[PDB]
PDB file of C-alpha atoms (C1' of nucleotides) in Angstrom:
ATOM      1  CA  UNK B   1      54.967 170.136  62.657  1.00 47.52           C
ATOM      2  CA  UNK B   2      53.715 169.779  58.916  1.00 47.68           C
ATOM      3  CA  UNK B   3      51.100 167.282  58.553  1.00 49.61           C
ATOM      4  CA  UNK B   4      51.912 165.995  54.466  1.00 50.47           C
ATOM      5  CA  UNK B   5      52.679 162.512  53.571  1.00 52.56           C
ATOM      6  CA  UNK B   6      51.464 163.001  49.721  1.00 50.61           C
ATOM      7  CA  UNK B   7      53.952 165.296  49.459  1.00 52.16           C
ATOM      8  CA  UNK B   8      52.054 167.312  47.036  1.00 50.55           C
ATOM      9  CA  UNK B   9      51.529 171.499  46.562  1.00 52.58           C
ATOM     10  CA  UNK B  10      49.797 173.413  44.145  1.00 52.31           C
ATOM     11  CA  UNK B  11      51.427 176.827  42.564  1.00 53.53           C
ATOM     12  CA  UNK B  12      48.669 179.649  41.709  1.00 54.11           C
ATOM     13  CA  UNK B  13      50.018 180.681  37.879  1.00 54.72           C
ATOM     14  CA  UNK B  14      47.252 183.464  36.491  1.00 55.42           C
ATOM     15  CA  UNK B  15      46.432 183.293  32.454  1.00 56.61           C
ATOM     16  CA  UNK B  16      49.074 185.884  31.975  1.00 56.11           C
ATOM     17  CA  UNK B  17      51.328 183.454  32.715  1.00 58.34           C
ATOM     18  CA  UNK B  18      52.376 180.187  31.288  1.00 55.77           C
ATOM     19  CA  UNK B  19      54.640 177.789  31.941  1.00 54.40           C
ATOM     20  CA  UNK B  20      55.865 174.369  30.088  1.00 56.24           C
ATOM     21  CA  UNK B  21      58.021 171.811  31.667  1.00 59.23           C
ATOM     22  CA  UNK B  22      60.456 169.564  29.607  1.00 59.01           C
ATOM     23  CA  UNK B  23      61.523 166.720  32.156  1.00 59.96           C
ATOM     24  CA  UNK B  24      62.886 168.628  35.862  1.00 63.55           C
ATOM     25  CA  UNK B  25      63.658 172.126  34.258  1.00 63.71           C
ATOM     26  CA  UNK B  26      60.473 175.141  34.511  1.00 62.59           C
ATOM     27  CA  UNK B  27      60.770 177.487  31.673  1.00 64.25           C
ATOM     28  CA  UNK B  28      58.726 180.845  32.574  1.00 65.42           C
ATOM     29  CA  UNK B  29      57.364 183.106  29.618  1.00 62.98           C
ATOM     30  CA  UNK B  30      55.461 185.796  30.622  1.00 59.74           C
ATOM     31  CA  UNK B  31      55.149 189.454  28.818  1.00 63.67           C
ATOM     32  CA  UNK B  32      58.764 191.044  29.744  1.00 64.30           C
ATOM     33  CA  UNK B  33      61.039 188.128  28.877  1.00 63.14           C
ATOM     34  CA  UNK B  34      61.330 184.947  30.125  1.00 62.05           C
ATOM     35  CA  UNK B  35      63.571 183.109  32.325  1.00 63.79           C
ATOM     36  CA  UNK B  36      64.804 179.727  32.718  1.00 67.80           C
ATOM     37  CA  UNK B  37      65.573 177.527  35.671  1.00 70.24           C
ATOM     38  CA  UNK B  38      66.739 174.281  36.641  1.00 67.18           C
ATOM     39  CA  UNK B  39      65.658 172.838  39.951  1.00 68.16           C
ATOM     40  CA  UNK B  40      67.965 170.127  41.141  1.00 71.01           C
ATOM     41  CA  UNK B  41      66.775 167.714  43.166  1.00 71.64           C
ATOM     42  CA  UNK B  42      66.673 163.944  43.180  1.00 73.19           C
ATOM     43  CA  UNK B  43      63.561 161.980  43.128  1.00 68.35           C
ATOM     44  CA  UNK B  44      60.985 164.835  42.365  1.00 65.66           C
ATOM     45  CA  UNK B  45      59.122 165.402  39.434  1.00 67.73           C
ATOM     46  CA  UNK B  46      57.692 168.719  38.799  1.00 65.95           C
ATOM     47  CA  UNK B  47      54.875 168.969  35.857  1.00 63.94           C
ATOM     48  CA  UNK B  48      52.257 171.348  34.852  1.00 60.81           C
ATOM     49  CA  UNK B  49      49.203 170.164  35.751  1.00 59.18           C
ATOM     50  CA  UNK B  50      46.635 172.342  33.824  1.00 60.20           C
ATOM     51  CA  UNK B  51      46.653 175.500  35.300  1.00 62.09           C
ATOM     52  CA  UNK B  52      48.676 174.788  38.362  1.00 62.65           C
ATOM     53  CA  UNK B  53      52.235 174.098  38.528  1.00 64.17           C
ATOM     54  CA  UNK B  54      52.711 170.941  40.927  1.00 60.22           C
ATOM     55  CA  UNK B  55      55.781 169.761  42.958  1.00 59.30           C
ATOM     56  CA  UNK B  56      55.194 166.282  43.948  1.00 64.38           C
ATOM     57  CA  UNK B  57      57.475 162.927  45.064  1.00 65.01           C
ATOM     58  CA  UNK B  58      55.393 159.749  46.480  1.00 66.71           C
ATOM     59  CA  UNK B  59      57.826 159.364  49.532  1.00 66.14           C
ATOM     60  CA  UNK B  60      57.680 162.335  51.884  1.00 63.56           C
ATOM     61  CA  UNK B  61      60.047 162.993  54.111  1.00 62.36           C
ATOM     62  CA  UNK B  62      61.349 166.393  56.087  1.00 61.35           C
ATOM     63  CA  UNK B  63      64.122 167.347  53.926  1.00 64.38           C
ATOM     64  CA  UNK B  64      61.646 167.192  50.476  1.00 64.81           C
ATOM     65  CA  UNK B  65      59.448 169.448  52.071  1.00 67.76           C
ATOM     66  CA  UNK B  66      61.723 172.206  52.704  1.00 70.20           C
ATOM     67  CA  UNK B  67      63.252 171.551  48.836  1.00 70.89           C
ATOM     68  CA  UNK B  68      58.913 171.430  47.704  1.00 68.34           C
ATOM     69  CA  UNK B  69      58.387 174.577  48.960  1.00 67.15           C
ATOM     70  CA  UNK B  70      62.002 176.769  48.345  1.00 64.59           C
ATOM     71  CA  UNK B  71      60.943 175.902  44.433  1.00 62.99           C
ATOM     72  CA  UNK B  72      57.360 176.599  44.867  1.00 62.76           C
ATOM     73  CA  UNK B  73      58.597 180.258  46.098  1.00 62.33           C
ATOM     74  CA  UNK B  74      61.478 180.193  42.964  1.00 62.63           C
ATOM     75  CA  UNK B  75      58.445 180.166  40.436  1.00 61.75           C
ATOM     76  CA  UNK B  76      56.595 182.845  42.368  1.00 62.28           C
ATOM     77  CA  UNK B  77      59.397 185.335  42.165  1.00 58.57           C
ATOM     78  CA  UNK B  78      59.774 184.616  38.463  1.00 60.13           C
ATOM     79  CA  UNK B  79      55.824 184.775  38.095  1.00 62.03           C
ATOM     80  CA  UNK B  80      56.412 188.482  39.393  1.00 60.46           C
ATOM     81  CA  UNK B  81      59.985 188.605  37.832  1.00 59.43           C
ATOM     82  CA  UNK B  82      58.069 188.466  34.496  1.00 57.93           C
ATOM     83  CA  UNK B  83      55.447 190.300  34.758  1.00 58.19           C
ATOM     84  CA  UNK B  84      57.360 193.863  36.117  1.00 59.39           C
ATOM     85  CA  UNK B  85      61.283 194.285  37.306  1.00 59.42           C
ATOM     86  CA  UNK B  86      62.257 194.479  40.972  1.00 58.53           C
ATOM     87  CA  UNK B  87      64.249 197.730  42.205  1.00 60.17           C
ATOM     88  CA  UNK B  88      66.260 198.237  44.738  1.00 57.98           C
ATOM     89  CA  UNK B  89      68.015 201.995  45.910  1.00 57.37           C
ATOM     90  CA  UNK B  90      71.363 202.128  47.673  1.00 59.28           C
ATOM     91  CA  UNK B  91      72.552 205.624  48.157  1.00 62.42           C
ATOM     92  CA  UNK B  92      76.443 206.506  48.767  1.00 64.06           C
ATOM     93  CA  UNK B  93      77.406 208.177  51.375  1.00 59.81           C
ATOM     94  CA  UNK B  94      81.014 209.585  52.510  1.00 64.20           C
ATOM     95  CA  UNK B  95      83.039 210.849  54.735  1.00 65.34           C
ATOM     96  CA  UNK B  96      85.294 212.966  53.569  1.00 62.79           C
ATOM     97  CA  UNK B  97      86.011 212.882  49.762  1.00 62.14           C
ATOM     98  CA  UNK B  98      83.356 213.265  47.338  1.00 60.80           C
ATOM     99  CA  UNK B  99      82.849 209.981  45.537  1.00 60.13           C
ATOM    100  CA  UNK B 100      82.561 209.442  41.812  1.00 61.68           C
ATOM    101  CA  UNK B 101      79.835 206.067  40.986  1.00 60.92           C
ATOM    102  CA  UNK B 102      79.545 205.715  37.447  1.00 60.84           C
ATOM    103  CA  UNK B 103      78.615 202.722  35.233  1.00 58.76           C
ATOM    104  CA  UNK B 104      81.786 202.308  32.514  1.00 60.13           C
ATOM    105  CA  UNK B 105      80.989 198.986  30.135  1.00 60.07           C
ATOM    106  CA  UNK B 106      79.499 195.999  32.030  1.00 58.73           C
ATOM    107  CA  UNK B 107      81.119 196.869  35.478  1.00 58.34           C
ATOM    108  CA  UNK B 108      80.680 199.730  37.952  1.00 56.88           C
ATOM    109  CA  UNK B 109      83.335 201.857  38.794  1.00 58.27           C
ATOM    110  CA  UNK B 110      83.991 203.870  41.979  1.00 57.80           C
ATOM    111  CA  UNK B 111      86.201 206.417  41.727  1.00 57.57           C
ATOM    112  CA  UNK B 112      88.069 209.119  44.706  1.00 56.86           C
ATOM    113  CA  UNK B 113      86.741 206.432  47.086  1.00 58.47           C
ATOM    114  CA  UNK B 114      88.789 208.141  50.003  1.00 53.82           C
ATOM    115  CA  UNK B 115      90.907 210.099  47.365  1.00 54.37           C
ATOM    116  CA  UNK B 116      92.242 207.121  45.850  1.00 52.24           C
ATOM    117  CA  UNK B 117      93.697 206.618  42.598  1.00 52.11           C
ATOM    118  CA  UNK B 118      92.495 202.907  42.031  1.00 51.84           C
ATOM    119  CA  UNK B 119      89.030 201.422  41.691  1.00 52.51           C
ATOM    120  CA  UNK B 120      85.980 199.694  43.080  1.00 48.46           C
ATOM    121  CA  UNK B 121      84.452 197.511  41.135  1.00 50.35           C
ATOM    122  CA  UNK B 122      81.433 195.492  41.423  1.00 55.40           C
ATOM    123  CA  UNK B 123      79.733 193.187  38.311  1.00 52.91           C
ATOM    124  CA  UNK B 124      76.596 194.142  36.925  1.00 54.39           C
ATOM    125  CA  UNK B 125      75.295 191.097  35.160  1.00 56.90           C
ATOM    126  CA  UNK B 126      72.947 192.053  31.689  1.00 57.13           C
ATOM    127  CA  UNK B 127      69.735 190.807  33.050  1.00 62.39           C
ATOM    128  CA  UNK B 128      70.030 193.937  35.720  1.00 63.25           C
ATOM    129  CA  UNK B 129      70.602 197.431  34.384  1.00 62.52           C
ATOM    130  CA  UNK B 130      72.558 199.779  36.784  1.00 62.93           C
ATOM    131  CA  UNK B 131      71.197 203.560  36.356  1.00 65.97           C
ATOM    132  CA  UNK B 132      73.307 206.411  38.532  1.00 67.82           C
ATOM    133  CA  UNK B 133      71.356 209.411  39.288  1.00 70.06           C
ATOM    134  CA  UNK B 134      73.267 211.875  41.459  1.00 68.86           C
ATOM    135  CA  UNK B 135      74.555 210.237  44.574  1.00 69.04           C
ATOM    136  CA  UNK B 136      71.154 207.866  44.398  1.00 69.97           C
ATOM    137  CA  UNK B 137      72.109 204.689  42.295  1.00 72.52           C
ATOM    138  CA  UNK B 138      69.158 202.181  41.285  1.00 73.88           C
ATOM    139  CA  UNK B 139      69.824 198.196  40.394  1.00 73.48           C
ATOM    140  CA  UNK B 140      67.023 197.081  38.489  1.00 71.19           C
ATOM    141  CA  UNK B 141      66.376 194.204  36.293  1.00 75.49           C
ATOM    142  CA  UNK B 142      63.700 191.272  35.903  1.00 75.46           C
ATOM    143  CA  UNK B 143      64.577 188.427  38.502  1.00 75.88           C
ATOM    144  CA  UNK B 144      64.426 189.008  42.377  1.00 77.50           C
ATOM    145  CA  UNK B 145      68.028 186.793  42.283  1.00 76.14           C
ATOM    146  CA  UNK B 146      69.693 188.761  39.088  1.00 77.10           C
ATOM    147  CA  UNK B 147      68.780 191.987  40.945  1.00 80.89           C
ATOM    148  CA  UNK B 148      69.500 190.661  44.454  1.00 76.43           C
ATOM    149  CA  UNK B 149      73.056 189.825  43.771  1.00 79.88           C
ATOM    150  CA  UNK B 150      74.546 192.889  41.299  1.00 78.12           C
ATOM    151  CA  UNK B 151      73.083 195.383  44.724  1.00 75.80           C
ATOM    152  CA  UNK B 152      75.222 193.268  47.138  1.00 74.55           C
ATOM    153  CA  UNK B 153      78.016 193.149  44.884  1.00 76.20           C
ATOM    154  CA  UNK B 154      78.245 197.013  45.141  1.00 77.67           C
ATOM    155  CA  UNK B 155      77.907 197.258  48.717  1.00 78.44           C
ATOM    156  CA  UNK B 156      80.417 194.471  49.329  1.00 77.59           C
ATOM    157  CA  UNK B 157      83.244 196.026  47.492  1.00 80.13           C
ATOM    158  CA  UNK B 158      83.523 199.161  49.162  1.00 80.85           C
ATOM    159  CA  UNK B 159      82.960 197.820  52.848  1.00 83.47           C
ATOM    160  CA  UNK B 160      84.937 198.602  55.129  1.00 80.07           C
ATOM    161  CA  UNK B 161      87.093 196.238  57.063  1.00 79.26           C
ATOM    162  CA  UNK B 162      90.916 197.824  56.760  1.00 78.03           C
ATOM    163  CA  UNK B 163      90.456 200.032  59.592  1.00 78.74           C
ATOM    164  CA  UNK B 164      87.665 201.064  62.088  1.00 76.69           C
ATOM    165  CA  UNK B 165      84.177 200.788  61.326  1.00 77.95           C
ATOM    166  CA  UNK B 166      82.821 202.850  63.409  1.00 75.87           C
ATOM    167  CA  UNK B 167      84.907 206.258  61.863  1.00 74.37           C
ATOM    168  CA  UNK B 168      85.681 204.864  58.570  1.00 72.81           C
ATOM    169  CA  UNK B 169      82.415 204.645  56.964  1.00 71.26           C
ATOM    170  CA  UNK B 170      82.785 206.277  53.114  1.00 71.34           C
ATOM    171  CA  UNK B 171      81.130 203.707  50.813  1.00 68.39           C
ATOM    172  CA  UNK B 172      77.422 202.302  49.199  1.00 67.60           C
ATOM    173  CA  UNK B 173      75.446 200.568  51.174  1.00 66.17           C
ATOM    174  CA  UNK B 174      71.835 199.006  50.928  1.00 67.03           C
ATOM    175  CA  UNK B 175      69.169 201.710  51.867  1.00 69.93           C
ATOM    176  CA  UNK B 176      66.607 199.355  50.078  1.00 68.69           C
ATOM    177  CA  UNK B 177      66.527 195.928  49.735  1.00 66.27           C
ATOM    178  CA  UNK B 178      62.819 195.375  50.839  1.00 64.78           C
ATOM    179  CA  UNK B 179      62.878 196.943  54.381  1.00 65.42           C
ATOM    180  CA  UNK B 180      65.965 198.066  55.545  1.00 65.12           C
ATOM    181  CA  UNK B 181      68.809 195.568  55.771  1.00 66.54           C
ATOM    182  CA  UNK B 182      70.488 194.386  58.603  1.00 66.60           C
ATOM    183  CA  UNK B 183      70.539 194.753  62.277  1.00 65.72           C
ATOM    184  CA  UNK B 184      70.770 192.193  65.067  1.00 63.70           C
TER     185      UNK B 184
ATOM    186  C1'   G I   1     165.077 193.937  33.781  1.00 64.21           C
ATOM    187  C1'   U I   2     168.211 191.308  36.975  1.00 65.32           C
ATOM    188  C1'   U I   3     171.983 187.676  41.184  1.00 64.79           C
ATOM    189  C1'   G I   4     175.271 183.572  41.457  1.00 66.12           C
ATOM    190  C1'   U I   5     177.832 180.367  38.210  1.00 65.13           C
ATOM    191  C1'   C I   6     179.312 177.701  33.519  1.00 63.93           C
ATOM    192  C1'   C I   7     180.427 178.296  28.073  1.00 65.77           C
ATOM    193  C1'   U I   8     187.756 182.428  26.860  1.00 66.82           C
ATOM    194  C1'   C I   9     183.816 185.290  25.151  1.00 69.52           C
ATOM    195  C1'   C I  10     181.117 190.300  23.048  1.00 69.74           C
ATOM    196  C1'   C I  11     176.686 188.035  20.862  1.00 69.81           C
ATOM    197  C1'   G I  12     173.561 183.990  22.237  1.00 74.74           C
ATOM    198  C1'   G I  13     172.347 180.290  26.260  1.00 74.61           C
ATOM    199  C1'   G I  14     171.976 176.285  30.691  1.00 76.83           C
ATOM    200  C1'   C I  15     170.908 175.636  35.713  1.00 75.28           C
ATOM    201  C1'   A I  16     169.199 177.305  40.980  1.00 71.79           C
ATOM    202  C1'   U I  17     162.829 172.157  39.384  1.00 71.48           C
ATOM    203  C1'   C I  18     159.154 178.876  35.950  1.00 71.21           C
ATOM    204  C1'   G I  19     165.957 181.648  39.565  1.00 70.60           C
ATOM    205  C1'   C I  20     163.835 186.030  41.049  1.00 71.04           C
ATOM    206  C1'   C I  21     161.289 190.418  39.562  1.00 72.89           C
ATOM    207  C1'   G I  22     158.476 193.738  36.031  1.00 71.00           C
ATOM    208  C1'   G I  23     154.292 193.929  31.830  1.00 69.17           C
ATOM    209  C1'   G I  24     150.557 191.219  29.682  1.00 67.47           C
ATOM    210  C1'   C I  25     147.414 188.960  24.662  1.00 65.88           C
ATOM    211  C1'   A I  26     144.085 184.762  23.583  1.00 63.10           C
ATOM    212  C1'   G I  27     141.485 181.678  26.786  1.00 62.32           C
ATOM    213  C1'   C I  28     139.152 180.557  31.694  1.00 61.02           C
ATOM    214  C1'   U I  29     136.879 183.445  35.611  1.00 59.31           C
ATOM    215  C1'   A I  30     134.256 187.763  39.718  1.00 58.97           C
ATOM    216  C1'   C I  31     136.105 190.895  43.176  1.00 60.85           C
ATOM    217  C1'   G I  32     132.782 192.408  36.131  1.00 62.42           C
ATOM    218  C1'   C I  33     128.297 192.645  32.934  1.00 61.83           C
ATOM    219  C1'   C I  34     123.087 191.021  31.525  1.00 61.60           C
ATOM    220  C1'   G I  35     118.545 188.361  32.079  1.00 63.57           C
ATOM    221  C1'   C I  36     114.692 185.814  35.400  1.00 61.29           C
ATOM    222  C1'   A I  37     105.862 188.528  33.658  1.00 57.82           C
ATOM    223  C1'   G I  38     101.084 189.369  33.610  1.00 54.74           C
ATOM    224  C1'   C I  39      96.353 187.419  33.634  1.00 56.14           C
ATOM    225  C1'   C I  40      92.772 183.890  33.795  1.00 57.23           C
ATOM    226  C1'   G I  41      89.962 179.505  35.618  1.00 59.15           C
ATOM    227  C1'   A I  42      88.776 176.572  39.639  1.00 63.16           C
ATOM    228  C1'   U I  43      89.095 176.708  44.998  1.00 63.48           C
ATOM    229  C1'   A I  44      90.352 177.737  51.048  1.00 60.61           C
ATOM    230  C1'   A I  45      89.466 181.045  54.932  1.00 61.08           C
ATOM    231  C1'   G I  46      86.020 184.736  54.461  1.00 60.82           C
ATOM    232  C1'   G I  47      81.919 188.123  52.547  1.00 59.53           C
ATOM    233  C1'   C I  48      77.156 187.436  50.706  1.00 59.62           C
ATOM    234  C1'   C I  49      72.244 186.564  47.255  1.00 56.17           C
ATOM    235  C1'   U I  50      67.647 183.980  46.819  1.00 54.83           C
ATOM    236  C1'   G I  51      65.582 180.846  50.447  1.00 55.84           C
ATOM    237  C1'   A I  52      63.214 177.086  53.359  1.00 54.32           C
ATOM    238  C1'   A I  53      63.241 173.483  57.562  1.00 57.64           C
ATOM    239  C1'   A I  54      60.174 176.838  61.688  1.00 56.61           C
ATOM    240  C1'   G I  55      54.054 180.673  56.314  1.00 57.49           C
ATOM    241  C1'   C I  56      58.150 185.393  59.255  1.00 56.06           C
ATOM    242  C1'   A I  57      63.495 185.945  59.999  1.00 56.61           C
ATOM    243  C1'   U I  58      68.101 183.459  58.481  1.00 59.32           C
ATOM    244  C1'   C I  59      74.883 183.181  53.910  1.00 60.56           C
ATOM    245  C1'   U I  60      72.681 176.757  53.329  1.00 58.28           C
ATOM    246  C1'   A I  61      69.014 172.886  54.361  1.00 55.60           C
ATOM    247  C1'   A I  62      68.979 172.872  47.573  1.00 54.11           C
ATOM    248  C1'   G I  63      70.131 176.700  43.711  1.00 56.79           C
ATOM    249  C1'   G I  64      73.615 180.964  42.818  1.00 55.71           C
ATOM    250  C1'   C I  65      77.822 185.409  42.885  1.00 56.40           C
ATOM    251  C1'   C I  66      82.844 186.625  44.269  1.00 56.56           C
ATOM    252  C1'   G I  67      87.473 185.310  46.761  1.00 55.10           C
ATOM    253  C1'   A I  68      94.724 183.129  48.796  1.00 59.70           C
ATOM    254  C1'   A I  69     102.082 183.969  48.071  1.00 61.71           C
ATOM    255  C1'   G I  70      98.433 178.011  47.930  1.00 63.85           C
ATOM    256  C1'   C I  71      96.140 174.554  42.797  1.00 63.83           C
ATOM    257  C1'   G I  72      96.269 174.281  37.164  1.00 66.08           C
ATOM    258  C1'   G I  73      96.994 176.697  32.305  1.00 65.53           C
ATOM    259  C1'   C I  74     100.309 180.256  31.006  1.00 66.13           C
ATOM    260  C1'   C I  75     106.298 179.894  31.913  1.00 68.66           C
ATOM    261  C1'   C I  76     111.377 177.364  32.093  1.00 66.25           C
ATOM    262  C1'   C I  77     114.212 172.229  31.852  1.00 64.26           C
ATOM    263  C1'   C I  78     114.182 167.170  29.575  1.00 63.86           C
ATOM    264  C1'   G I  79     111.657 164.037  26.396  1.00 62.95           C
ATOM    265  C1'   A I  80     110.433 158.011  19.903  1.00 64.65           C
TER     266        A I  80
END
RNA sequence: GUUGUCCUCCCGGGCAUCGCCGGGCAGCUACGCCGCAGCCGAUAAGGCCUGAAAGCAUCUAAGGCCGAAGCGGCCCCCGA
């Protein structure tokens, strides 16, 4: 198991990417916006240390190691969140009655979901833009977070649970998240 | 309207503890009429995102998104 008692890592930043630190908040400007975060934790400081963004706290123990290295990863997906967007595809899919996904305002609706009269609805925060192209929809945005929760969201709205799930199965689900979510 | 009886008595009255019966205004009542929201925020159970401990995976270990007739505002009653 981990041999540390510094605790210290090191986060690769390139030159087209800088970051400043004001006290235990990272602020990441990059070319396509920026983004802010706050890591919370007690007892760490995080600085920029010339080139290299470093986590540190004196007193290792298990738990700060775990916390060192979950916000070491946070700045790398915001490193990459910066520099491009992240995109991922669900497609809808039905079983009887074709099935209406349109973006109206700030929130998606899904109409003649199983000939119903009522909608869906799912938010679609402003970081992420929601784009519907036929019966493939696209989440997109800048963070890995932003864009990971508006595509669950969708998919969570519209699952089934109110009858069988094996024969009921009209709705949008994740066809990309990164592989192909979820099995056991 | 009407029985008995009293006033001689038509008229007009007493009493039988409203004499009894018939109608019914005001007023009071139902067996009458009229009125008595939504939404939101924060949360449970739950569904999840990112994501480590365990380079992967994982809804949690931190961060983050929703979500009860229940909880508050909203609402009704009292209140120098």
């Amino acid at each position: 198991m981990p041999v540390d008692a510094w605790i210290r890592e090191e986060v690769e930043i390139p030159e087209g990417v800088e970051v400043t630190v004001e006290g235990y908040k990272v602020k990441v400007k990059g070319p396509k916006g920026e983004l802010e975060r706050e890591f919370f934790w007690p007892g760490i400081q995080i600085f920029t240390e010339d080139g290299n963004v470093v986590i540190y706290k004196d007193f290792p123990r298990r738990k700060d190691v775990a916390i060192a290295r979950t916000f070491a990863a946070h700045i790398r997906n915001m490193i990459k969140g910066v520099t491009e967007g992240f995109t991922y595809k669900l497609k809808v899919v039905y079983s009887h009655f074709p099935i209406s996904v349109k973006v109206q305002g700030d929130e998606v609706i899904i109409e003649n979901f199983l000939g119903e009269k009522a909608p869906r609805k799912a938010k679609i925060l402003p970081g992420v833009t929601v784009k519907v192209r036929g019966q493939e929809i696209i989440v997109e945005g800048i963070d890995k977070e932003a864009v990971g929760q508006t595509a669950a969201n969708i998919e969570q709205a519209t699952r089934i649970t109110k009858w069988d799930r094996r024969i009921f199965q009209d709705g949008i689900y994740i066809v990309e998240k990164a592989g192909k979510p979820i099995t056991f």
